[PDB]
Amino acid sequence: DSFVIRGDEVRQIAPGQTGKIADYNYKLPDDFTGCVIAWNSNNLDS
Amino acid sequence: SALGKLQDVVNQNAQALNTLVKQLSSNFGAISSVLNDILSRLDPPEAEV
Numbered sequence: 001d002s003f004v005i006r007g008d009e010v011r012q013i014a015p016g017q018t019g020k021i022a023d024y025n026y027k028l029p030d031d032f033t034g035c036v037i038a039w040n041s042n043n044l045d046s
Numbered sequence: 047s048a049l050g051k052l053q054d055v056v057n058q059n060a061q062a063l064n065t066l067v068k069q070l071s072s073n074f075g076a077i078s079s080v081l082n083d084i085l086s087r088l089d090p091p092e093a094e095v
Contacts, residue, residue: 016091030091 001026004045010038 005013005021012019015032022028071079078084085093 016089018089 004041005038007040013038 003026009019009021011017012022013026013028013036015028015030017028073079076084077088
C-alpha cells in the first residue's frame with residue numbers, strides 16, 4: 001500500500017492510533033503483521 | 047447445635063456462593079471493576095489489556 005503523507009501525523013500509520021489519517025483516510029487493523037517503511041521525498045515531491 | 051451437622055452444610059454452601067459473587071467487585075489491578083466502565087473510556091488496543 002503506497003501513498004504520500006506528511007511528517008506531522010505520519011506516525012499515525014500504526015496499529016491502534018487515532019487522528020484524521022487513521023480515522024478517515026487509512027486505518028490498520030489491531031493485529032497487523034507486516035512492516036511500515038517511510039522516507040523523506042523532499043527532492044521529488046517538493 | 048444438636049443439628050449442627052446438618053446446618054453446617056447449608057452455611058458452607060451459602061458462604062462459598064456468597065464469596066463467589068463478591069469476587070466480582072475486585073479490580074485485580076485493572077483501572078475499574080466494571081467491565082463496561084473501562085470499555086467505555088479506553089481504546090480497544092489498551093482495553094484488551
